[PDB]
From a paper:
The SARS-CoV-2 spike protein, especially the RBD region, serves as the primary target for interfering with the virus entry process. S1 comprises the receptor-binding domain (RBD) and the N terminal domain (NTD), which mediate the recognition of and binding to the human receptors, including human angiotensin-converting enzyme 2 (hACE2) and other potential co-receptors. To gain further insights into the structural basis of the blocking and neutralizing mechanism, we selected 2 potent hACE2-blocking antibodies (PR1077 and PR953), alongside 1 non-blocker PR961, for subsequent structural analysis. The structure of the antibody Fab/Spike-RBD complex was resolved by X-ray crystallography at the resolutions of 2.5, 2.1, and 2.2 Å, respectively.
Specifically, PR1077 is located directly at the RBM region of SARS-CoV-2 Spike RBD; the buried surface areas (BSAs) of the heavy and light chains were 873.5 Å2 and 190.8 Å2, respectively, inducing steric hindrance to the binding of receptor hACE2. All the heavy chain complementarity-determining regions (HCDRs) and light chain complementary-determining regions (LCDRs) participate in the interaction with SARS-CoV-2 RBD, mainly contributed by polar interactions and hydrogen bonds. F27, Y31, Y32, W52, Y53, F59, P101, L103, and F105 of the HCDRs and Y35, Y37, and Y54 of the LCDRs form strong hydrophobic interactions with the hydrophobic rim constituted by Y449, Y453, L455, F456, F486, Y489, F490, L492, Y495, and Y505. In addition, interactions were also facilitated by the hydrogen bond network constituted by Y31, Y32, W52, Y53, D54, S56, N57, R58, G101, G102, R104, and R106 of the HCDRs and H31, N33, Y35, Y54, Y37, and T99 of the LCDRs. It is worth noting that water molecules also played an important role in LCDR interactions with SARS-CoV-2 RBD. An interesting feature of PR1077 is the relatively short HCDR3 sequence. The Cα of P100, P101, and G102 of the HCDR3 is only about 4 Å away from the corresponding RBD residues, indicating that longer HCDR3 sequence, or the side chains of other amino acids, would clash with the RBD if they were present at this location. To analyze its potential binding mode on SARS-CoV-2 spike trimer, PR1077 was superimposed to the spike trimer structure. Interestingly, PR1077 epitope was shown to be fully accessible in either the open or “all close state” spike trimer. Notably, PR1077 also displayed broad spectrum of binding affinity against all spike protein mutants tested, as well as excellent neutralizing activity in pseudovirus assay, including the currently prevalent variants D614G, V367F, V483A, and G476S.
Residue numbers in the entry:
A (entry chain B): 334 to 535
B (entry chain A): -1 to 119, 128 to 247
């Protein structure tokens, strides 16, 4: 009953960041060590918890959040960050207990002429609360004239594509990101590390 | 909307092989939210897209005929767009327009400048994947007050899973710079009278004028904004009979 992290990290397609995907992990045996010793990840930052100490702990639920952003925004997937991604797209809490994993995906997510499929939110009436997800497409009212569902002066469609292109510098190339957050409820813990087994050993 | 101003400079007469830098001073709107384009028109010819730069400078695309020789850049703190042209050739001779592109929904030229003239004294490209736009008819003599319709087919579907058709129509009145008429297949631009309407989907599109007025005379172009390079039709000349 290994935890299905392969379905998250190796998913053939990744969500746009404004519509970031969440997978709930429960009732399985987690080995964060196979992730931590990988070397394919350019980013593996953990907040609060040590990644090796992670294999010795138990949680009620583990949430895997995945999306694509560009390289120089990966730094925004951290507590206390501001910027277009953290303010309008995916927001980590200041008390974040968990890990941010990222790697470069130019070879999958860029194409000549540009990849327009990946979108981010450029505007919003207010910053997102932590782990809030906004998937709406209302014309954004940048000025005092109401928009009433019509694009116009100071009336903007709020989602915009990166246009990822293979010759872009690395700070502009696409990065796949997995954020792991750990829930300890009052309930029983069902996600434990590999040294907890229910099978007899000889 | 009416107060948007784009003012190109830098044009002149230069020898082949020399360099020239175009400028476009923008006022009247938040320049740093818009992508910016250069579009050119050789004398007596249609419109040809040149280059685009993302609202924040992070991303640029070029037409193949200018790849490497031209560089597009911008200074958001001076609200100015630039075109650095190197190794000028005779075929580069044209009027160069800057145009704005609003956030989202891929490509659109919703405000145009005046042009600078640069004097150096419709194909699918080498690989065949560039979208070709074909318009019909070439000229359309019209009597005032009677309807008009013109058509545009594209070599590739402009319908996306979005449900959007990335097709626009642009009008160039005689002696004027082009202007947006219809965007995304069927939406009128601000101020376009309701006697204009665009229809169609996928690969076949039509523009209809319910009752042509003499101020509607010009050359109408279709254009796809689905992917780069951005490509225009050959244009349809609407004139009074
Ligand atoms: C994903 O990719 C390869 C197998 O194709 C392997 O290196 C890795 O362990 C797989 N699983 C995870 C969770 O990354
Ligand atoms: Ca746009």
């Amino acid at each position: 009953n290994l935890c299905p992290f392969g379905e998250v990290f190796n998913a053939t397609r990744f969500a746009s960041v404004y519509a970031w995907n969440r997978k709930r992990i429960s009732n399985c045996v987690a080995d964060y060590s196979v992730l931590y010793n990988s070397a394919s990840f350019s980013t593996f930052k953990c907040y609060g918890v040590s990644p090796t100490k992670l294999n010795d702990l138990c949680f009620t639920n583990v949430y895997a959040d995945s999306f694509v952003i560009r390289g120089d925004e990966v730094r925004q997937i951290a507590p206390g960050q501001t910027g277009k991604i953290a303010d309008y797209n995916y927001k980590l809490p200041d008390d974040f207990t968990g890990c941010v994993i990222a790697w470069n995906s130019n070879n999958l997510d860029s194409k000549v002429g540009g990849n327009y499929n990946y979108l981010y939110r450029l505007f919003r009436k207010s910053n997102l609360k932590p782990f809030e997800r906004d998937i709406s497409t209302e014309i954004y009212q940048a000025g005092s004239t109401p928009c009433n569902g019509v694009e116009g002066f100071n009336c903007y469609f709020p989602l915009q594509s990166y246009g990822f292109q293979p010759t872009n510098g690395v700070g502009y190339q696409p990065y796949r990101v997995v954020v792991l957050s750990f829930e300890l409820l009052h309930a029983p813990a069902t996600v434990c590390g590999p040294k907890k087994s229910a099978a007899a050993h000889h | 909307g009416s107060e948007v101003q784009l003012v190109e400079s830098g044009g002149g007469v230069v020898q082949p092989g020399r360099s020239l830098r175009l400028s476009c001073a923008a006022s009247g709107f938040t320049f740093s939210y818009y992508g910016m384009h250069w579009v050119r028109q050789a004398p007596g010819k249609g419109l040809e897209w040149v280059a685009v730069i993302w609202y924040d400078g992070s991303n640029r695309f070029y037409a193949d005929s200018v790849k490497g020789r031209f560089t597009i850049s911008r200074d958001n703190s001076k609200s100015t767009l630039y075109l650095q042209m190197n190794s000028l050739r005779a075929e580069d001779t044209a009027v160069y327009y800057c145009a704005t592109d609003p956030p989202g929904l891929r490509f659109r030229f919703d405000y145009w400048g005046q042009g600078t003239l640069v004097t150096v004294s419709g194909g699918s490209g080498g690989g065949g994947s560039d979208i070709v736009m074909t318009q019909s008819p070439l000229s359309l003599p019209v009597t005032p007050g009677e309807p008009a319709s013109i058509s545009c087919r594209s070599s590739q579907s402009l319908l996306h899973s979005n449900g959007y058709n990335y097709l626009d129509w642009y009008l160039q009145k005689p002696g004027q710079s082009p202007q947006l008429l219809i965007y995304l297949g069927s939406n009128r631009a601000s101020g376009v009278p309701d006697r204009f309407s665009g229809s169609g989907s996928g690969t076949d599109f039509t523009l209809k004028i319910s009752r042509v007025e003499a101020e509607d005379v010009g050359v109408y172009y279709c254009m796809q904004g689905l992917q780069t390079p951005l490509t225009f039709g050959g244009g349809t000349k609407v004139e009074i009979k």
